[model samples]
Target: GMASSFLEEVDRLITLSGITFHASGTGTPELIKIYQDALGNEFPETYKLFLEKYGTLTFNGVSFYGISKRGLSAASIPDVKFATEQARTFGDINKEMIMIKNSGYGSIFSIDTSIIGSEGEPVIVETNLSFKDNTEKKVVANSFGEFLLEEIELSLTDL
Candidate 1:
């Protein structure tokens, strides 16, 4: 309820500001100044604190970066085992850009981390975006379809 109310208030304020700004038909610089002035007037302490604290922090070896600096330690999780596994897999692939296909319209990206082999190689691990449709059922009916195919192929080749 609080989030919903907050979002509604933000939407209302944005709409009001947009109407006022449009009515003024001010030049780009003037509009920007007006917007900044309005924001500062609305949240003076926040704006002041942002400017004061922005350049004082460093994150990921980058200084004066607001996005990276804000709660850097709290945001990042460093797992040595996970990192090592990822590095090994990526090194074997020898490809910098992995193919990430959107499963369908408006799908959430996901990866299959369940496929485990003795050699620890990611054997055709399924990587797909989430899809909610009967049309694309076969695309992800079984998460290990690709891995099965690859295994069969390798076995046949060995035979």
Candidate 2:
């Protein structure tokens, strides 16, 4: 459920930040190639297992955005990778397991009420491994986005 415009913006951000976005595929072979190419020498076994289990992976982008601020947090990345790898760990896990071509936001705030507080560390609300449905997912997505924007506005006003 990645909008073309959002994808464009993501690409622009990546380009501007000098980060690479590789492996946009829903095929095991292609994903394997990306893993082999990207993390080859450093994590061969990890990369090999990743390709063997989750060669074809689909990202639930909005879920990523909603769960983790900006989707690049060190805290969130490992869990995301773990879920994806678990989904792909066994070759028996077929399309139904890996093909996540949907978008939407689950009510994570409801489950993790602690996140609402101002002082505590960020609570892990939800773990988004695959894509989601359209309209429903946006409910959480837009809510979180507006919340973050409001927080930013408040911070700027205080300054």
Candidate 3:
């Protein structure tokens, strides 16, 4: 429903902005489940749909992490599993948080599974590796679909 509208906005922005981007590949429901099992968190439903269609994407030069063609079992770069695990290793996040985007300089955007919304999606948040607690957070969006739309808007503005 609104997920497609959100993605349509993403496409509309990129198309008019003249920016370059890439989708690594697409995902399947089985692959999405595999990633969820590996990461120990179910991706928000909209994000699962995104993975099914886009796999992983770099829109306007900023990466939005998701299940990639490499797959979680491979745990390769840019895949959601690899990103989350690496963040955990560096003490930037915990199991309840799923890494979603890297805004550079150790600043990361993630889904906080500890707080599920009425839509069954966790709120998106921003945290940094520099924080002593590592868990210090700021709300980014109410849901993954919203976050995707906002990030694309920000990308267009940055151009």
Candidate 4:
């Protein structure tokens, strides 16, 4: 129920931002699955839901990296790949930590797998933007959807 509510608000925010153009499109289900498998941790259904609808879309001026269905031709395919790699710079990311976004503030946000498989997990941010200590993660939102809502609201200040 929360996911549905969250998706609606994301759409509303995207429309309000006037950035209706979807920067990313449908992703490679196989590729994404491979990622899910390789991560060695079970990602929540809500995460899968988010990827299914808005996987790689740059909603509200922020990018959620995703693979391109067009094979290796598009730059967006490597979009998510690169993001994950960059995220590992934090060191010892482990199978439980999955980076969701960079937040463009020298900080990164990720899903804390330790939270479990159900109601989605907490969206965490790097406490130290410079990435001094890898364990220095802070919970910013109760879930990814909530994180987006908060993010969109904060973007309003820049306007």
Candidate 5:
């Protein structure tokens, strides 16, 4: 499965780089279902697996957001729900778009639920805060697994 392979690669890179790595914790089935139910679109299997194994992760000071049990009070690392819900308040972001990363500079990354791939995963896209629509979204990766692997690779290069 891409989810397993992706995590293996992430672990390999982190071990090789000997960088500081942190995973929030494994997700509970109840929590995962709560997010799936509230988020509108069904989350990809890869993402669900990710939530189960690694709720959220931080590698080399970079983070790929995930379902979190913690509330939104922590500014050090915001959860996926907080980010997506906040964006939706703008009333412009796509209903299928679930934000997973925030660049903290107006740029945001989300999974385009409307553009599902053969494996039932959606493409990751980049857009900005205050955007009127998803028409300008830039494809970042084919799926969440690809996005996670790419982030690990890119973080390694910066070391």
Candidate 6:
């Protein structure tokens, strides 16, 4: 089985990163489901797994800016409504693109469903808005799992 305890592995790495977490991924099915529907995009397996298993994460780590949960809140980082609205502000974003996390570094993490040639496949796209010169786009990961793992790795070293 290719079953990977990737989340746990990332968890361990995060502890060493110096970033602290407050609320960690504990929500109900209906809550995440409703949030998903609000995004106007269905989950690509890995992300669906994130919402279901890791609903809302309130962490100051560099791994993920934040993943909105039922009870989690931040400045301008409202619930699903805020996420959905921000996605729309991009205007040029594809209908299938779903914002899953804010990099906490003036960037957004979203899944590019257009490359969903296979079920659960995720292509992570990063839109950096912090630069003083201009905005930029970078395809960070080819799959959500890879994105999570890689981001956690960065969180460990960068944070």
Indicate which candidate wins on lDDT. Answer: 3
Question: Residue-wise lDDT of candidate 6 within 1-159, one digit each (tens)?
Answer: 111565666567656767665444655667656656766666666665555656545454333322454343533553444664566675524466666677566677767776643334868877665422353457878777667767667656664
TM-score of each: 0.15, 0.22, 0.85, 0.72, 0.85, 0.67
Q: Which residue runs does candidate 5 get wrong by more than 4 Å?
A: 69-77
Q: Deviation in angstroms for 126 in model 5?
A: 0.5
Q: For residues 33-112, could you state the per-residue lDDT of candidate 1 as single tens digits?
A: 44235322221222113223231222222111111222223132121112223423544211211111232344311122
Off by over 4 Å in 6: 1-3, 15-18, 58-75, 78-81, 89-92, 103-106, 117-120, 128-137
Which 10 consecutive positions of candidate 1 have the poorest summed lDDT? 18-27
Better of 1 and 6 by lDDT: 6
lDDT of 5 at 89: 73
Which scores higher on lDDT, 2 or 5? 5
**lDDT of all the models against the reference?**
0.26, 0.28, 0.79, 0.60, 0.75, 0.58
lDDT of 4 by residue, 44-140 (tens): 5556666666656654567655554453344432255455545565463544677777655666667777753335554554444545554666667
Instruction: Give a tens-digit lDDT track for model 3, residues 8-66.
Output: 76667768776677887768889888889977887877888778878887865688888
Question: Which of 3 and 4 is ahead in TM-score?
Answer: 3
Q: Which candidate would rank higher by TM-score, 1 or 4?
A: 4
- Residue-by-residue lDDT tens digits, candidate 2, 1-159: 222233343334434443223332332544445432432222222223333333322222222211112222224322233333343453212222211122344232211222332322122223243323221111222222223223333333443
| TM-score for predicted model 6 compared with the true structure | 0.67
Q: What clash pairs does model 5 have? A: none
Residue-pair clashes per candidate, as listed?
0, 8, 0, 0, 0, 0
- The list of candidate 3 runs beyond 4 A from truth reads 12-17, 73-76, 117-120, 130-134
